[PDB]
Design a protein around this ligand. Structure first.
Ligand SMILES: O=C(N[C@@H]1C[C@H]1c1ccccc1)c1cc(Cl)cc(COc2cnc3[nH]ccc3c2)c1
Length: 286
């Protein structure tokens, strides 16, 4: 059975998508002084029958996700009520906004250390490892879809595609799906093939973002059209394809790992179990 929405106090808009929007909410009566804060996804004001259907399917997907580094479904609104999904409020916002504020610690004003960058990335790899065990393909992994809680805890989400802050991250063509082409493997762009291996590619790009402290867009100086043509160069494999450059905060060893994520052949990209071990262990000696 479900959760009574009467108990919700809407406080702030956190995200906005095709059919839904997310609000910060206060739950009236976890100390007696402080209220309980949650994030609540509800239908958009322009929602229709179609929106309700998509909402019901998202509930089905979310009810499956039970991992420390994936957002969890705390509850849904009572049957009588307008549809809602409730999850934890992640108090430090999305990872892109959070990291963007910081600079890399100067070995010789918020700063963040290289080992903390590894810790962030490792948590993302752990969440993705779990999704891989469920044979669940994310399709839109990026730092804008990761959320930051207390003590640099990271949870992967998939939301807020219509956030104005990230409008430039999506390639929109009338009559087509909205596509995050700068994060997409070449076979996603060319054939629409999304797999765990293309989630690994997107993880490589997400790792690049983290090591750039989210201060630059992948392929930022190239046009959307140039990014799409680059996928063509991966397909043709005449050595004219290009890659994201090594971030200044990224040691060559870690960069080589990212390059493996962007292997032309899907089967040659590393599994998330391997990525996680590298980021949690091997990366520490560099
Ligand atoms: O990702 C969601 N649903 C997708 C189906 C789930 C999924 C699919 C694939 C992979 C992973 C997850 C999702 C749902 C709900 Cl109710 C709420 C949210 C957003 O929540 C927060 C919380 N705190 C925040 N602070 C600042 C912003 C912010 C946003 C996102």
């Amino acid at each position: 059975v479900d959760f009574p929405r009467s108990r919700l106090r809407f406080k702030e808009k956190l995200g906005e998508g095709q059919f839904g929007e997310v609000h910060l909410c206060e739950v009236d009566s976890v100390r007696k002084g402080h209220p309980l804060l949650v994030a609540v996804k509800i239908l958009r004001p322009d929602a229709t029958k179609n929106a309700r259907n998509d909402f019901l399917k998202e509930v089905k997907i979310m009810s499956r996700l039970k991992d420390p580094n994936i957002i969890r479904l705390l509850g849904v609104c009572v049957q009588d009520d307008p549809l809602c999904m409730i999850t934890d409020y992640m108090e430090n916002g999305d990872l892109n906004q959070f990291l963007s504020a910081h600079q890399l610690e100067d070995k010789a004003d918020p700063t963040i250390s290289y080992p903390m960058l590894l810790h962030v990335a490792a948590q993302i790899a752990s969440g993705m490892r779990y999704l891989a065990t469920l044979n669940f393909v994310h399709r839109d992994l990026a730092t804008r879809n990761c959320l930051v809680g207390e003590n640099f805890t990271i949870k992967i989400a998939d939301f807020g595609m219509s956030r104005n802050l990230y409008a430039g991250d999506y390639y929109r063509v009338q009559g087509r799906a909205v596509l995050p082409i700068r994060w997409m493997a070449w076979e996603c762009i060319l054939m629409g093939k999304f797999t765990t291996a293309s989630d690994v590619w997107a993880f490589g790009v997400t790792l690049w973002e983290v090591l750039m402290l989210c201060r630059a867009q992948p392929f930022g100086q190239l046009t959307d059209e140039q990014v799409i043509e680059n996928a063509g160069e991966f397909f043709r494999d005449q050595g004219r394809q290009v890659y994201l450059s090594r971030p200044p905060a990224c040691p060559q060893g870690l960069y080589e790992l990212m390059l493996r994520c962007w292997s032309r052949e899907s089967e040659q990209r590393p599994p998330f179990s391997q990525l996680h071990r590298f980021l949690a262990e091997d990366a520490l000696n560099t």
